[PDB]
Structure formats: C-alpha cells, structure tokens
C-alpha cells in the first residue's frame, strides 16, 4: 500500500507518521509568534524544516536566516533553534525528524529532549 | 553554523544537501509529464515526497492517490512509484532520501537503484 497524508497545514503542531526511523510533523506558527528559542535543542534528532508558505526568521546557533516558501533547514541534533513568524499570515512548515523526536501524544522522546 | 538553502522550485531534478544519512532533492515536473513508472524503485532508500504546489497523481505499488499542495508520501524502499503532473502548471516537490539515494552528479547510488 501507500503511506500517505494530505497535510491541512493549519495545526500549531501535529505529529504525522513514521517510517524506518524518520518521523514527519506539521508546525504552523501564527503571526507575531515564535516556536523554540536560544536554549531549544533536540539532543538526539536532526530536524529537517521546510517552509511551505509564509515569511519568517530562523535563528540556529546564533546564525540568522530569513525564511520564505522553499526555505529548507537541516537542523542538526544539538543545535539551538528558534523559528519566528515575521509576516501577517501563518508560517506553514513541514518537519522531518531523524531519528524520531516525538511520541504519539506529541511529547518529546529522549532524542527530542534538550 | 546553519545548513540552509532556499529552493528555487523550478528544476526538473536537483540534488541538494545531506546530513547524517538523509539527503534532500528538488523535483519539479512539467505539465503533461511524469517521473518514474510501474518498474521505478529505490532498492535501499526510502523517499519522503512532499508536494509544495500544483496538482498530480502518484501511483505507488498500484495504489493511486490524487496529489495537491500538502500531499506527503513516505515511499518505502523497494516500492514501485510514479508521479504524474495532471494540471497545467508545474508540480513542485521536495524529497527526502533515507539513506541517501544519489551521488554528486545526480546519479543513483546503489541504494537509489532498482
Ligand atoms: Zn537562554
Ligand atoms: Zn525543533
Ligand atoms: Zn555534527
Ligand atoms: Zn537513519
Ligand atoms: Zn513495466
Ligand atoms: Zn524516487
Ligand atoms: Zn517494510
């Protein structure tokens, strides 16, 4: 069969599915808001963050990058990261964790913890 | 530092970067075209395919799914897959291979071969 989902891209944070130690999640940040911070790390999981729409700013270990549709970040395990919505529409992202970072309640696994 | 790229989302196929045995690639399929087929497999790499924009159809081991922005497929290693553009605008996708499937010339690695 096919392992498939159409992301609604309207959830603050929603864990989607996994396959062989990669896990997908949706994260949509409202205008004027941010997720993570200068002390926000996943000690054992890389996070591949892709911007589907909107405008924002990533700070990754003190390095700053403007975000737009098409922006891709490979956030290595252990790197502090913050994602800020700097526009006036939702900042829509899809995220790939390797290995997985979150349990079925959307709580961090040991690998997803700081 | 930050491992970052803004995808142009206008290349038929462009390998992007890797981190710790996950590799990203852009694939944009022109109207009336298709990539892969009923015999198209990566024997040793899963492929996570995400649709950024456009409209299409995936066939994965004979299973059919309409594709739109937000569509996510986890195409397991060994699964036959074909992606057809069924609209009249480009079908823009980003792809995550685990383990990596392609070398620096965009040719399949052993894991990316059928
Ligand atoms: Zn602090
Ligand atoms: Zn994170
Ligand atoms: Zn490292
Ligand atoms: Zn792995
Ligand atoms: Zn055939
Ligand atoms: Zn493929
Ligand atoms: Zn399997």
Numbering used by the authors:
A (entry chain A), B (entry chain A): 0 to 113
Q: What are the paper's exact sentences on this?
A:
The tcmJ gene of Xanthomonas cam­pestris pv. campestris strain ATCC 33913 encodes a protein from the cupin superfamily, XcTcmJ, with a molecular weight of 12.2 kDa (residues 1–113) and a calculated isoelectric point of 4.9. XcTcmJ is among several gene products from X. campestris that have been annotated as being involved in tetracenomycin polyketide biosynthesis. XcTcmJ belongs to the cupin superfamily, the members of which have a conserved β-barrel fold and have been classified into at least 18 functional classes involved in a range of biochemical processes, including plant growth and development.
XcTcmJ was crystallized in a monoclinic space group (C2) in the presence of zinc acetate and the structure was determined to 1.6 Å resolution. Thus, the octahedral coordination geometry and coordinating water molecule both suggest a likely functional role for the bound zinc. XC5357 was crystallized in a triclinic form without zinc, whereas XcTcmJ crystallized in a monoclinic space group in the presence of zinc acetate. Comparison of the solvent-accessible surfaces (see supplementary material) indicates that a deep surface cavity is eliminated upon the conformational rearrangements arising from the binding of zinc acetate. Furthermore, a new channel is formed on the surface of XcTcmJ that is surrounded by nonpolar residues including Ala11, Phe12, Val27 and Ile28 that may reflect the natural substrate-binding site.
